[PDB]
From a paper:
Recently, several unexpectedly diverse compounds were reported to deplete cyclin K by linking CDK12–cyclin K to the DDB1–CUL4–RBX1 E3 ligase. Here, to investigate how chemically dissimilar small molecules trigger cyclin K degradation, we evaluated 91 candidate degraders in structural, biophysical and cellular studies and reveal all compounds acquire glue activity via simultaneous CDK12 binding and engagement of DDB1 interfacial residues, in particular Arg928. Crystallographic dissection of 28 ternary complexes demonstrated that despite considerable diversity of the molecular glues, the overall complex architecture is highly similar. The low-affinity DDB1–CDK12 interaction primes the complex, while the ligand, through filling the kinase pocket and bridging over to DDB1, drives robust association, offering a rationale for the unusually broad chemical diversity observed.
Interestingly, multiple other, small cyclin K degraders have recently been published. Structural evaluation of HQ461 (82), Z11 (83), Z7 (84), dCeMM3 (85) and Z12 (86) revealed that all promote the formation of an analogous ternary complex, and sustain the hinge hydrogen bonds and the π–cation interaction with DDB1 Arg928 (suboptimal for Z11 and dCeMM3; for HQ461 and Z11 we observe hydrogen bonding with the side chain instead), while also displaying interactions with additional residues. Those include CDK12 Tyr815 (hydrogen bonds for Z7 and Z11), Glu814 (CAr-H···O interaction for Z7, Z11 and dCeMM3), Phe813 (halogen bonds for Z7 and dCeMM3) and Ile733 (hydrogen bond for HQ461). Some compounds instead contact Arg928 via hydrogen bonding (for example, HQ461 and Z11) and hydrophobic interactions (for example, DS06). Small cyclin K degraders such as Z11 or HQ461 show less optimal engagement of the ATP pocket than CR8 derivatives. Accordingly, while CR8 displayed CDK IC50 values of 40–200 nM, the smaller compounds show weaker CDK association. DDB1–CDK12 complex formation and cyclin K degradation can thus be achieved with small, almost fragment-like compounds.
Numbering used by the authors:
A (entry chain B): 715 to 1043
B (entry chain C): 20 to 267
C (entry chain A): 1 to 393, 708 to 1140
The structure:
Amino acid sequence: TESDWGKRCVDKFDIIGIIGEGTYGQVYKAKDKDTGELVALKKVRLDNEKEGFPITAIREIKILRQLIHRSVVNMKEIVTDKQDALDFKKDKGAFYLVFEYMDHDLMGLLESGLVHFSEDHIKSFMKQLMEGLEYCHKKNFLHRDIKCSNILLNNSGQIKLADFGLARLYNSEESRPYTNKVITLWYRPPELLLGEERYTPAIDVWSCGCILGELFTKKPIFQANLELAQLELISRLCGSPCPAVWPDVIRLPYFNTMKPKKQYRRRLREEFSFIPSAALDLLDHMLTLDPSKRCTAEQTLQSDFLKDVELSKMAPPDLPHWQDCHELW
Amino acid sequence: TKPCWYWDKKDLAHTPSQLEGLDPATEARYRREGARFIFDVGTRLGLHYDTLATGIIYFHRFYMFHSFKQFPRYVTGACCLFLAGKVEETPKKCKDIIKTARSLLNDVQFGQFGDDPKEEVMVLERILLQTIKFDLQVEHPYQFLLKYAKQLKGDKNKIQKLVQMAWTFVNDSLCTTLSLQWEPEIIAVAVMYLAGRLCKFEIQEWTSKPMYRRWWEQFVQDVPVDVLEDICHQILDLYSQGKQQMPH
Amino acid sequence: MSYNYVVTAQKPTAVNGCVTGHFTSAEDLNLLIAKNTRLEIYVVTAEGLRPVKEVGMYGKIAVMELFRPKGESKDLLFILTAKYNACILEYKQSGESIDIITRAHGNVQDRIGRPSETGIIGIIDPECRMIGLRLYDGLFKVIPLDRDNKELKAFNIRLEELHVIDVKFLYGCQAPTICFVYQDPQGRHVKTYEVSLREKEFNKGPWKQENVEAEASMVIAVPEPFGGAIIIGQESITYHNGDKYLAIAPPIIKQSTIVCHNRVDPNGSRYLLGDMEGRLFMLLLEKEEQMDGTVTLKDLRVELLGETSIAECLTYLDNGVVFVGSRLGDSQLVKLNVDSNEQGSYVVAMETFTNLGPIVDMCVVDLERQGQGQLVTCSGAFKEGSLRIIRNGQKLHIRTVPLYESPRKICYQEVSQCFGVLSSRIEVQDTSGGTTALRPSASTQALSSSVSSSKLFSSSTAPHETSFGEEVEVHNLLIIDQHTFEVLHAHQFLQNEYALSLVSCKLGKDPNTYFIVGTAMVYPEEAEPKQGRIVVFQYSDGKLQTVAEKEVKGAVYSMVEFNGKLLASINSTVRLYEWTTEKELRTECNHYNNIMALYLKTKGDFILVGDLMRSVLLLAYKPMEGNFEEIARDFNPNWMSAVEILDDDNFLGAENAFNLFVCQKDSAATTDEERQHLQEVGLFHLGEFVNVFCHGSLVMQNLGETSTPTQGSVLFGTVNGMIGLVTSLSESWYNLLLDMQNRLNKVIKSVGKIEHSFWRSFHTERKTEPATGFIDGDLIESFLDISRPKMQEVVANLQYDDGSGMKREATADDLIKVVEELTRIH
Ligand SMILES: COc1ccc(C)cc1N1C[C@@H](C(=O)Nc2nc3ccccc3[nH]2)CC1=O
């Protein structure tokens, strides 16, 4: 049946090439021989034999067979290398995680400068992303790695969230000890910079707000290489962490340790004056220092900016594929 | 989409082990020892109750597709617990699971691990994953026992006595094939039903509908008493066979 | 890691901007011509221009304006680089010693902002109270010109109008006032604001908004006699000032888009206007004086003067001499006469300044049978299209071959003693239903000619409607003699067929040498071409014969000869064709994991592919199997403009951000993943847009082979005419030259006080990185031009390495000899 994963062989896919590198193995693009559907294969190398099958992959197999949403990538099946006949101990073959192939990735399109977003395009983009995050957040799952690279976009304008390798369940009642350093520095929330270690689902919201700004500027909002320097960049725009705006900031491990140069005032509305007001309100709320005052995903979907957006009109972004090779004369 | 993990009692006479000449009593014994091995090892390591149960469910499912004569049970159990830890985010190093197993198993029993215990366990992970069809998410009677108990309103001491007795019945049902016959929601109701009979409590009064004598139908739809009685009979059989008695 | 060396063989020739003022002295009139990264200062004489000084800047010159604040004797120069380095410069001369003073400097980049579509704009107040900068959508930046602002500190005023087309400071206003054209969903408008340095905000402007032409492009600040502004569009020119409104819409300007404007008479009575087809117009302001004593603007008139080279910038200079600053063609000095000549023209050319124009493609060929290659470049566009033959002579000798149509690709066929050139000319839909060319050109003046009769796409049934006046490109293959450079034959391709690729080679067991062209069927409706041809031609006895055609399902962007087989890239696919004994192309194998296979290069059985995005991929042909294999791909996202193979392990690329990088095969083998990953080991900000990489050297070998420390030779051509050369170094030689750069940067004074390390840092809007693996040869070669005290200062405590001498001291004379050997590579 369709449900007996791990047995079908990777022979069933014609490998087209390597579309990227992944934590547990290299990622390949393949065409299904039977249906002709283009897929993506994630190679899981269990030959390491240090701790067996990588937990990062286990999380992606556990979570993505539960989550069904348009804005969440679908794992179609799991296939294997030709296994050694009747000798599992000799068998060192790897497993492949099949996913629906996506034409482009956000960071790729932005880095190549080949994409331009209108307000309506940003509306359609953010609505899908936040709706997917709401589905995941309602199922009490935390992504913990929201980056531009992990947002896959089809040419139709559909958005899907993808790398669930650092994803874990959130318990509101029982505060659970979590890994402190979980998102890439450019999209990391302030609590994790100050070392909360017991983060809320609001870590993912802060990231999506950083993306919201990036879609308007075409450049990441806070790009730094050191955790303190990131806090400084955030502090300049969002304001310095202080007890008045974040009453519990004093309980954070590094609040006394990590300090901005000054107690900067919030300037978000001023520095993003070119952003539309409906969006600017969303950004101010998504980039709130206090995780308890930071907006939820649902609250973003019930915003003036995203609520009356209709996803029937996908509004696909501007991806010129001709006369882009030629230079404007 | 998703696999079916439930068989009929009658289907258990045609497990791979039965067909290799193992008699029903022996496979049941092997299943209890393996499950209890998983439980004892994980408790020593400080593992969450869900992690222990997940390993036991992996274990029970495994030997619905393979024979006990070809796969030594304690190696299988250790592998299940090792994987369960990664699935449930309570991970342990394979070497540590092996160490704890050495303490609890005698020398003959540890012989199953062969000359290299860690390797025999790590090598099995491939077969375990393919066998469980990569359906790693498992639900256990515990969550439903608490979700349903929270909706009961009444004497705090009487309800808490119901919960703990039922909780013990859940821990005892992991040694059986009930996990392979009935969804966890039914098991949670069955153990509430059993404890209620034993404590002479009438749970209906604590539910929102006090004249609904089939109190469970508000938690689990379409469950006949036939089922709940079959489960109760199976749980109490473990107590009558052993020397242990009902907790009360 | 990898070590490479990059030098300029020819400096940028295209004119990016030109201003006139009194920069060297209050009495002299100067013309400051700006080329990319280069500033040229002249003095206007009666015969022409007198050069006085040229400087380089560590930045692309984006804004250049001359201003004279109260208290200064002479004009000061403001320059802003494309990386947002700002400075105010002063000319100072002490007898024979000429130097450039950095009076103020700083970097004005904002942490958060959206770069504007119409680019950086810089304007200065008529009272020189402030510098206005339009860098980001929705923001106006003010640098106030107070004596104390030596760091050029500035503030931003919120601008409601997000999409601004053009802005100027107006004349005759009570406060500093800006006039700008902006676009919102309702069309284009002209609006005014007043700028308050005291309040650091905008106040209501002197006159109300007016709706203007949809394609309103340029704003002219009319001088005090008239006041107000003139708005130039595609069809109309309008004057605005409070209640006064004029509009002239003469049919002559609708024909071609106007790109530049300049003031002739300081009173504002006359302006110069120029359009893309080269026509130069005079815009006349007809005055009317009222008995009140006030002069009003009565009417506007436009008069055609003649033809110049397509001009990016115009400057009136003095008398009738006008400087035509051309980026697409040769710049010029032309004289405006009061009386027309017998052809009706008032414009007569005086001098012609060489501009290698956009170098679309180039080839290195030893035409004169010497020891050196001559570089034949596809240069210029439209009526300025030319072929340029460049040979090393101390100056470069350049021969110009006018085509009057756009050249696209060039290849050399020695068997035929001729060159094959792809060209496109502009025709316009005319009343016949066909099209008519605006002027004769190479493809129409060929000795013999032919037109494709292919029936491949003839089935059509796809409608493409035509409106009178719309432009079309007509593509041709030109056969050009290598000695006379006479067009021997022109082959015109199908209607709507673009010629994108060209090769000259023999295939298989076929002894004939062919011209092979790859094309794309280009329809305005299509996002990406879905039809195309590979055409095999034979040039024989003065006639081009069509040998074979292969239909493809896309655009043949690139082709290259591969061991007797034809390697072609069709959209995403990279394909290898065999040439059968039946003289037809047969597909052997394909590779599909590409976004767009724009660029191809080969070496042995290895293929380097460069996509529109995802940088470069190393493919290999496995002859035992008859297929392609992915050896190693660069996973960093970059938009490619050109690629080249340096050696079997190093690969060179050019970004659309004016950056160069080198990727090396990891050459380790522990994991397969490591081999598959190409590590970018070189990063360099060139500052030019590289279209064509080409192995070869213009230097003539004295006898046999003489080699400096540099090994290998790659020439490259750019959009601004700059020609550069990339070569490799040993680890020992890199370290020596790198350590010396750091010493030279401490000694050499930069114009604008721009840090050299900053200038060469890799730069995309999203990422900025320090340069690596590249020696700025133009910095190294400047050691020979610094004074003796500075030379000895540089060599202090300098040690050699990785040689037979171990750690060797260096003297000023030792390094002078080393650099002079490096100057011989070009
Ligand atoms: C021909 O394209 C490539 C060639 C070479 C490289 C290096 C990249 C690309 N690609 C493939 C696209 C992608 O990332 N596709 C994807 N990645 C997935 C991960 C998980 C699930 C589905 C996925 N689909 C974006 C992109 O530029």
